[PDB]
Amino acid sequence: DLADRFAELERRYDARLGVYVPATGTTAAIEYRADERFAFCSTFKAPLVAAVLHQNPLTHLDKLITYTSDDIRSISPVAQQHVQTGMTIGQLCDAAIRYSDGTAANLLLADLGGPGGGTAAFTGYLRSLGDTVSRLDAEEPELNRDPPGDERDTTTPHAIALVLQQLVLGNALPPDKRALLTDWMARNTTGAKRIRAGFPADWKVIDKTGTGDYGRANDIAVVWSPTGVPYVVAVMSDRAGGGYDAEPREALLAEAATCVAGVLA
Ligand SMILES: O=C(O)[C@@H]1CS[C@H]([C@H]2C[C@@H]3CCSCN3N2)[C@@H](CO)CN1
């Protein structure tokens, strides 16, 4: 029984675990705390990039964005190295997804524009995909400071799964923008010990991770079986029982993904 395995893992890592895999083909939906709210953490960066792709011509990717010291306010492995020359929208999308670059995320939010520094339009983008649940209320690094239970800056494994399904497998984006998003998530550098670690090597995996205080660790992915059958896999977790300093545990998400992969094989 799968719900039993997920419960075992919660006890092992002193964690709250949320899992959703949408129903597809002759495969039933997998769901565990799938409608409870979990912090986005950095996972929002993937649909952010979709929002910015949708809103503009693909030529927009080549627009150069300049920024400086007081824009670097969060973990920003790529933006910190290019601050003197600036970065193109394209480079920023690349960094936001592949290195979870926070400054890139803020600059892309600003590019979207409108109230809340972009966060309202980010949310409106999800609403356009039929996601009535998720909300982004702040940008980096403030979006990470909400305590356990706080509804600000949250999604649900169910909500973000259906969003990612439309973005990557569905027609939320035209093919050329869709490929750009898909390719960036394929080339993700941060996700090796999470959902990717639970699936056999001959499965293709693309993903965006999230991490936070209170032991938050997320991963949202699309996986393809060796015969090309795709599944969307959303895994979210926290370990709020250990307080603000509780360490995120990637192994939890890797074990949860192993349980899911065995069921989808
Ligand atoms: O800039 C920040 O302070 C935040 C902290 S939480 C989390 C951090 C936390 C994790 C630790 C090491 S590197 C990647 N970092 N990503 C990110 C997304 O999951 C968001 N960036």
Q: What are the structural domains, with CATH classification, of the chain? A: 1-265 (3.40.710.10)
Contact between residue 18 and residue 157 where contact means Cβ atoms under 8 Å apart: yes
The type of residue at 46 is A
Q: How far is the CA of 140 from the centre of ligand 1 (A)?
A: 9
Per-residue HEC secondary structure of the chain comes to CHHHHHHHHHHHCCCEEEEEECCECCECCEEECCCCCEECHHHHHHHHHHHHHHHCCHHHHHCEECCCHHHCCCCCCCHHHCCCCCEEHHHHHHHHHHCCCHHHHHHHHHHHCCHHHHHHHHHHHHHHCCCCCCCCCCCCCHHHCCCCCCCCCEECHHHHHHHHHHHHCCCCCCHHHHHHHHHHHHCCCCCCCCHHHHCCCCCEEEEEEEECCCCCEEEEEEEECCCCCEEEEEEEEECHHHCCCCCCCHHHHHHHHHHHHHHHC
**Is residue 248 within 6 Å of ligand 1 at its C-beta?**
no
Paired tokens of 41 = 């953490």
Q: In angstroms, what is the span from residue 44 Cα to ligand 1's centroid?
A: 12
> Which resolution, in Å, applies to this structure?
1.9
Q: Is 75 in the pocket of ligand 1 (CB under 6 A)?
A: yes
From the list 141, 163, 142, 143, the residue with the least C-alpha distance to 222 is 163
Method of determination is X-ray
Annotated binding site for substrate: 100, 209-211
- The span from the CA of 109 to the CA of 42, in Å, is 13
